[PDB]
Design brief:
The structure is cut from a larger assembly and holds 1 copy of chain A (193 residues), 3 copies of chain B and 3 copies of chain E. Chain A is α+β, with helices and mostly antiparallel strands. Chain A folds into 2 domains: 1-112, no CATH class; 113-193, no CATH class. Chain A is built from 8 helices and 4 strands, in the order ααααααβαβββα. The radius of gyration of chain A is 24 Å and the shape is elongated. Chain B is 0% helix and 42% strand. Chain B has one domain: Thrombin, subunit H, CATH 2.40.10. Chain B has a 4-stranded antiparallel β-sheet, with no helix packed on it. With 52 residues, chain B is mainly β. Chain E starts with a helix and ends with a helix. Chains in contact: A-B, A-E, A-F, A-G, B-E, C-D, C-E, C-G, D-E, E-F. Chains D and E meet through α1 of D and loops of E. β8 (89-90) of chain C pairs parallel with β2 (37-40) of chain D. The structure holds adenosine-5'-triphosphate and magnesium ion. Adenosine-5'-triphosphate is lined by residues 154, 156-162 of chain G. Chain E: GO terms for molecular function: ADP binding; ATP binding; hydrolase activity; proton-transporting ATP synthase activity, rotational mechanism. Chain E: Belongs to the ATPase alpha/beta chains family. Chain E: Residues 45-109 form the ATPase F1/V1/A1 complex alpha/beta subunit N-terminal domain.
Chain lengths: 193, 52, 125, 52, 172, 29, 210
Amino acid sequence: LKLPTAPLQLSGTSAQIATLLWQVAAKENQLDKVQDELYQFIELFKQHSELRRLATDPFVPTLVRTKIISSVLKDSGASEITKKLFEALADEGALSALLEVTVNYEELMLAHKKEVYCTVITAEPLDKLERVELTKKAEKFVDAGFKLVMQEKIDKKLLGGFVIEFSDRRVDMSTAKKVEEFNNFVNKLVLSI
Amino acid sequence: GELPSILSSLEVEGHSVRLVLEVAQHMGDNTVRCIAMDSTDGLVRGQKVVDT
Amino acid sequence: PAIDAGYVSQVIGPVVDVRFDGELPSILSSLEVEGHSVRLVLEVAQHMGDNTVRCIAMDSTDGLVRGQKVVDTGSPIKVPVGRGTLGRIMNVIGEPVDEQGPIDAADIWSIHREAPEFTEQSTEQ
Amino acid sequence: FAGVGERTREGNDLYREMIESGVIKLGAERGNSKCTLVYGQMNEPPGARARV
Amino acid sequence: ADAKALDELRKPKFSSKYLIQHVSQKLIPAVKEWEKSYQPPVIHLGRVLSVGDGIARVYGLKSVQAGELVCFDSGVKGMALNLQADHVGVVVFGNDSVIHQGDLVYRTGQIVNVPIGPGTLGRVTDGLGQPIDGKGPLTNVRSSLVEVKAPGIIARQSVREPLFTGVKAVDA
Amino acid sequence: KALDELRKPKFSSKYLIQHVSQKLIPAVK
Amino acid sequence: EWEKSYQPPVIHLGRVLSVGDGIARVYGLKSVQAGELVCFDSGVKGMALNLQADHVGVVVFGNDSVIHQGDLVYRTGQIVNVPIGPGTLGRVTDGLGQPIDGKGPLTNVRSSLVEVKAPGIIARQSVREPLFTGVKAVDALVPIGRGQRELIIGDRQTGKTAVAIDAIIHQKNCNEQVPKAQRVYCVYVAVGQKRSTVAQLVKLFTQTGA
Ligand SMILES: Nc1ncnc2c1ncn2[C@@H]1O[C@H](COP(=O)(O)OP(=O)(O)OP(=O)(O)O)[C@@H](O)[C@H]1O
Ligand SMILES: [Mg+2]
């Protein structure tokens, strides 16, 4: 066959269902109908205690657990991706995997609108030109056609420059560390002469 | 349905020799683990097993 | 009172897991269990990974229920030290077990420290 | 004297024999004692004997 | 898949309720047609998940003390060794062939007891204090814990009195 | 928290995706 | 030239998932190398040893009590290295080369990797010149050439260190008599010993002049 490439490669057995769920929802152009139908089901477990009894209670028979789920999802225009997923997770008793699929469905979705989050920490609050010169620095730290959003915080422990935090890497072009990276270079070099 | 008790005898329906299983433990998820009194070669998953 | 007061999540003999809703205690911290028949302190041994610490009971755990409130003392087991502790019998957590009243202490030192450094050794025989 | 996981009878023997030796003095002369005892004896649970 | 990303799923983020409102009117009719196939739910009682090797795994029992007598509905006693997050592992004081998966586990509310007293004098009891000499129940007796801590250093004294064995090599 | 029962899943099958893929793929047009 | 050729690196982060017994499992750190020094935000270092698909296992160079769940661990970009050179002579260092004798930093030294590929067949030559132990049971019966690994095996308190110490002390006696090209510079690695035992050996080596 031929499925779309998932943007991220993820972990296993709950992140592995979510990347299969993303791939059949990218083939059907249902990447946001399936996503909010997950988000409805997250809310459906909070309100109905007998719906979450179909995911935690081990003494629910599997013939009950797949017939409550199918006869409840037969209408209301749910995606055929969704009501096939939910009878599959109810066949195996994996309905409690659903908080963990929804989290990994988000990370595949947010890497599909290449929107990457950010946090910029500066010394004092920015100008409108200090904002514009900074994204020109910062979209050279995302390696594709990605867009950075931003989040602006302040710290006068920095002496100007900035710290960009991407939640999996940071880049420190602040001059408070440029001082320390200068000092330790000349504290190493006078000991080499 | 209801599980057989531990040490109960189970007979496998449809097999070349009379195969008797003795229930050793209740594994959970409606499964019992059994030790066979004869050979288990030729045994298929989903074969009917009658609790005596 | 809500955070930095965790609850007993599982008890396996001498080993208790406490789940803290925020600000986990450090490893080697002492944790008091509220509502036990005796004073049960728990020394944090591991961070298990899901806001759970794994800790070791310094007394018996028969009686622990899986919701029991556990307060963190923010420090290791600290025992009375000094010249006031001479002639007394203490247990593991520094309580007097000789019925001679409380131990007056010059200091209350934690029982966990590092070795003296290599520059601190003395080589005399 | 750190007694780690040994007999409680021996903890009582050393404690009593130090009182008649004057190594441990009780009462108002407690400060003239020369020994402090820490006991985590073999009736304790394994967390108490691992830290005493 | 961190808990920072999982605790964002506490707050609602759907903004479209076309399936929440639908199944909330069909769920309770769906559960009602499957009620003779539900075992009644269990929170403070217990239900046996697995039994075998003389260890039962018991779902439920939300407020068992560690190491207390639980009672199966077969009449067998157990002792809640490890309370886990999802089950309780009990060790069965008796034959595990009479415990099934699905059995109710009741809580006695007491750490493991034997009858002690003057009326246990004369009797042949089992490992749990239940008498096997056939001459009735134990009377003039009260329950005490079997895992008392030994008396400490200050609760003891020296051994002064002789226990005469009557054996000649021993008492000499 | 009332959703905290579902935060940690554990499965009865190592090959759970091989059953899930046998029901999600024929949901495609 | 340093300032005109200067961009700060991106520092890849990681969160501590669980920590205990001197192992920290770390979420993230997706570009860390196997065998790479990491840096916890408590200041304590670490080495990424097994890079699993979901986490990194980090052995902690120090006491794991300062590491908490969710701590930030940064990678340093470098495989584990130590300072080599003549400035290490005379100094007592720890297992990563940091000096513990209390005599300041290691001057006149250079950081090199600790896991080097051993020299292959075409880089060797025959072991022909002797290393004199000074122990005459050794230099007569089991003599040792220069470039030869020799095991000192025995039970406890049978004199295995004394054979090794006498090889070190004798090199000092031989280094005062030979030309500069053939002088033997000893390294004594003391693994898992007492610190008092090590302070007795640097007292002997200072008193002998070794
Ligand atoms: N050649 C020797 N002549 C006399 N005494 C010796 C000799 N070698 C060792 N000894 C003495 O024997 C003791 C044991 O020696 P040494 O410490 O070298 O043993 P070891 O093998 O290093 O033991 P370990 O490392 O297990 O403690 C030392 O106290 C040393 O003084
Ligand atoms: Mg030695």
